[PDB]
Ligand binder design. Structure first.
Ligand SMILES: NC(=O)c1ccc[n+]([C@@H]2O[C@H](COP(=O)([O-])OP(=O)(O)OC[C@H]3O[C@@H](n4cnc5c(N)ncnc54)[C@H](O)[C@@H]3O)[C@@H](O)[C@H]2O)c1
Ligand SMILES: NC(=O)c1ccc[n+]([C@@H]2O[C@H](COP(=O)([O-])OP(=O)(O)OC[C@H]3O[C@@H](n4cnc5c(N)ncnc54)[C@H](O)[C@@H]3O)[C@@H](O)[C@H]2O)c1
Ligand SMILES: NC(=O)c1ccc[n+]([C@@H]2O[C@H](COP(=O)([O-])OP(=O)(O)OC[C@H]3O[C@@H](n4cnc5c(N)ncnc54)[C@H](O)[C@@H]3O)[C@@H](O)[C@H]2O)c1
Ligand SMILES: NC(=O)c1ccc[n+]([C@@H]2O[C@H](COP(=O)([O-])OP(=O)(O)OC[C@H]3O[C@@H](n4cnc5c(N)ncnc54)[C@H](O)[C@@H]3O)[C@@H](O)[C@H]2O)c1
Ligand SMILES: O=C(c1cccc(-c2cccc(O)c2F)n1)c1cccc(O)c1O
Ligand SMILES: O=C(c1cccc(-c2cccc(O)c2F)n1)c1cccc(O)c1O
Ligand SMILES: O=C(c1cccc(-c2cccc(O)c2F)n1)c1cccc(O)c1O
Ligand SMILES: O=C(c1cccc(-c2cccc(O)c2F)n1)c1cccc(O)c1O
Ligand code: NA
Ligand code: NA
Ligand code: NA
Ligand code: NA
Lengths: 251, 251, 251, 251
């Protein structure tokens, strides 16, 4: 209840799914948490539920929204210790010939440039607090995925950008790390499965893709984020896999 | 002189540097080569020098230029066997606070989306020939680089996209691989060194960054490309490091 | 003080250095800890210092010592939840022509087979508790090191064996992970530096090999071990780098 | 027919399987090849079949056999340019509790120490010729395999040792690289499948484990070896995956 007491955390895409799991984990560790989301429904409910969490409406693809998010966080809480760049989207499966440059650009705006913009605007405050950045990437940025060229590209970019930023910010003592989850049961996973010819089969396949035989939970990604923020003081530029072993062995 | 005889190769950014080394390597292996570049000076000279190479002016960031490039290649040579996505740029060193979203988007257009667009438009012809794609990424997409957040992100994206495309195109027998060079002596390396306070020191540091104690040559990247195209028939989705050992050990 | 309360942990090589840091971290998290070491001096003092730690003399290269260690742990505490295979050694720098097959075999016995034997003998008890194994490998197993062929080979083996064991034990819910530290200030680091022509220069070089500009502490490896044991329930077969960024960038 | 003309290559385990594919590839590239094997049947036939290959009976686990192999190679051909450490074995599937320390030591002697001993004894001659070493590791050293703890450990060691040796030998211009094959159809693969309850099913599963939908051929590993020896002059310490994409994606 005190391993990150007194610290201030911003979580983007914090209204549901992995982001909400990360919000809950940080509140339980004593932090004050700003929930950033473009959708009010989940984030407003979480603010009512959790002592120590507040909701700020913010679309991370809009530069002016992000400037306001950072200024409001400082105005309300006086410091900024950790930014968790979790907002992102996985489009439905698309063969390469079905993708468009336009759709690719739109996905880059969210999955990559939104993470870049918030990080850049937060860095002056993180340097003052010797804070840290946690990016949520994906296992498929490392090993690939079928029917997902744009998504995979965006997550390969996030993982690489994490390492570049870690080098740049190391003189200030600011650590920059990423978490690469595998299959985590979230509303996004459910929405994508619902598009498949047999959703039940897709979900079963998703559970069996891991040697541990289940999907991961948002709380498990949340615990990894709290570790990186609060206890991983000699870790920077790492990719922490939270995948249940999916990358291991033949299949 | 015959290991890729009768095949047709498109090399983007083929007018100088690594691209010109790749052009030369494929001509020497018996292929017909289309040199694609936005600058006429180097590419026109190479077309005059090399039997079996032709120059087509094409800016890979302009979709209509790329459509013309592909249609002209088929009209002139009747087939397409290999696309080498080499065109790209490394901006001068920039701290994170010195970068802009605008500059990041422009670099994504060249280093990532140009590679995507040509690949997508070429795939119908590569599927007919059971051809292959070779992307030129960078070691720093894997290990990071200081003062280069946008560049590193773009190359992490290219390496990841290679793996995604390999999965998608495997049913057709089309292989998709990337080469990740380290320090290669090219006009880009020379231009970036010239911006440094002491260019001579920068070049010396660049040579000593490799255990082999020198920078690589364009011809060495070219030989790796010919191997991937002509002899690596069980390789798809790989990242071939051509770095002189730079990623090894402590420094 | 309760994140691993009621659990029983065995730490090999627990009498000094990283191992002692891991012992302390687990005691502080509420666990009962068996300190295994071949040297009495450090381990006996730690047993007197720490409520909840006990010392058992055990050379992990002697199969009968390890059988006794496991049987005594069960007899005294009734369960076994976590094995930390930390015992190991780094010989002085040796060029390849200076190494011997005999010395290589001896190092394999300690760094690899000692980890194998304890793990194998503990698995029946770990399967009953749905416990976990943590192996201490090394960054140099992944990226190499000069003048250390046998050591590097042993640590590459440990990291790979971790992934194999994770696959085998996943049906039982037993997780198997490794930590790969970089430069950590320990008595081993001090002893190796003392052999160098200029120890002070060697230590300075060791601090500057990390972007964070210092060496790591045993407590930092200890915190990573507690995370893997207590909170990383969807992680198996991972390599957690605790290196201060040493593997990033050029040098 | 001339890309490695006039050079002398030693291939261990060259009498069948991948090793014989490597022998054939080097003979076809103009090299003189010493076939080293502990079994006469395949190697003697290959010597009769191939102009430019000779067979020397040698068990790489016996230090005196290896000393003779090196001295005879120099006596007969006057130089040594490339050593290919291919000899190795994969035991039948074994759960961890079914393995023994004794069997693990025996496998280390072959798969790891045999490679070490020949390399060490050859290095004085490779330094004179600015030659190179090619180790045959395995994809499963990188990603794990079930029911194969000892094998996986030995191949993780070989891959890591490759990187260490590359660092040590770089001042002499001697390159050290490894090839990590995936499923390659060889007599070993056939012998292991024959032990399975349904060999036909095991083989079908083995073909479908790769996105390319087939197993690899010895000739394909051979072509990769010739590339590394003859044309990869800026590559040292690399792991070249020859796997058909098996490590990509979910399964
Ligand atoms: N679910 C998985 O299996 C999985 C696996 C690997 C990686 N990831 C990554 O984890 C992250 C979260 O995934 P999830 O499954 O929880 O998704 P989700 O769709 O359930 O939740 C994403 C949240 O982000 C918000 N969001 C979307 N666009 C936004 C924007 N422009 N500005 C602000 N908020 C925005 C959404 O409103 C939503 O509340 C993503 O980056 C995703 O790529 C997910
Ligand atoms: N030089 C190195 O050390 C190095 C290292 C790693 C990776 N790389 C990569 O290798 C590739 C080539 O690098 P280089 O050093 O040879 O660079 P270079 O600048 O010497 O050559 C690049 C060529 O691409 C052309 N080009 C640029 N933009 C283009 C566009 N829009 N359309 C068509 N052609 C275009 C240029 O006119 C030029 O002829 C790049 O992708 C770079 O990121 C280079
Ligand atoms: N110190 C570093 O920078 C560093 C870096 C990476 C990995 N590591 C790894 O971390 C581990 C611990 O290293 P350290 O620096 O703390 O070393 P250390 O020498 O300070 O401590 C090692 C401990 O293990 C014990 N030990 C040795 N052989 C043993 C045996 N046969 N049976 C039982 N106990 C035995 C020693 O008595 C000692 O107490 C090793 O596996 C090492 O390879 C260390
Ligand atoms: N076949 C595969 O799918 C596969 C996959 C990955 C890696 N590998 C590796 O490739 C190598 C060759 O495998 P393969 O499938 O061709 O095996 P194989 O059993 O068909 O051939 C191995 C050869 O090595 C020889 N050999 C064995 N022990 C020896 C010793 N002590 N001294 C000298 N020669 C000895 C054998 O007599 C035989 O001719 C091995 O290192 C193996 O681990 C194989
Ligand atoms: O959200 C998903 C997800 C959910 C359901 C199906 C799929 C899916 C499965 C196979 C091919 C595809 O193109 C898919 F989109 N993916 C996801 C999965 C892994 C890693 C991730 O980062 C993710 O976000
Ligand atoms: O072109 C370069 C290059 C040339 C000269 C200096 C630098 C340089 C050195 C340190 C920090 C930086 O931000 C740099 F831009 N880079 C390059 C280097 C490695 C990998 C590549 O992909 C490349 O393109
Ligand atoms: O203990 C060491 C250590 C301590 C002091 C010097 C060296 C050292 C430095 C350069 C070349 C060598 O061969 C060395 F042995 N190593 C160590 C370092 C990194 C990773 C580890 O796993 C370790 O254990
Ligand atoms: O030889 C084999 C091989 C052949 C047939 C079955 C298996 C097999 C499949 C699943 C689990 C196991 O424990 C196995 F031994 N392996 C092999 C395969 C991949 C990589 C290699 O390096 C190899 O040598
Ligand atoms: Na609240
Ligand atoms: Na011409
Ligand atoms: Na005690
Ligand atoms: Na012969």
């Amino acid at each position: 209840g005190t391993r990150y007491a007194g610290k201030v955390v911003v979580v983007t895409g914090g209204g549901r799914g992995i982001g909400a799991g990360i919000v809950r984990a940080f509140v339980n560790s004593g932090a004050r948490v700003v929930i950033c989301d473009k959708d009010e429904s989940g984030g407003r409910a979480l603010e009512q539920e959790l002592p120590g969490a507040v909701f700020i409406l913010c679309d991370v693809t809009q530069e002016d929204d992000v400037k306001t998010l950072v200024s409001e966080t400082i105005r309300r809480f006086g410091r900024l210790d950790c930014v968790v760049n979790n907002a992102g989207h996985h489009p439905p499966p698309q063969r390469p010939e079905e993708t468009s440059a336009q759709g690719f650009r739109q996905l880059l705006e969210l999955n990559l440039l939104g993470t870049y913009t918030l990080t850049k605007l937060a860095l002056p405050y993180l340097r003052k607090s010797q804070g840290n950045v946690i990016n949520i990437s994906s296992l498929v940025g490392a090993i690939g995925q079928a029917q997902a060229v744009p998504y995979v590209a965006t997550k390969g970019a996030v993982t690489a950008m994490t390492k570049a930023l870690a080098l740049d910010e190391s003189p200030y003592g600011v650590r920059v790390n990423c978490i690469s989850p595998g299959n985590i049961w979230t509303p996004l996973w459910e929405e994508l499965a619902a598009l498949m010819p047999d959703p039940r089969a897709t979900i079963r396949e998703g559970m069996l893709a891991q040697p541990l035989g289940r999907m991961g939970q948002p709380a498990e990604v949340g615990a990894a984020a709290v570790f990186l923020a609060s206890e991983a003081n000699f870790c920077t530029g790492i990719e922490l896999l939270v995948t249940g072993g999916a990358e291991l062995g033949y299949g």
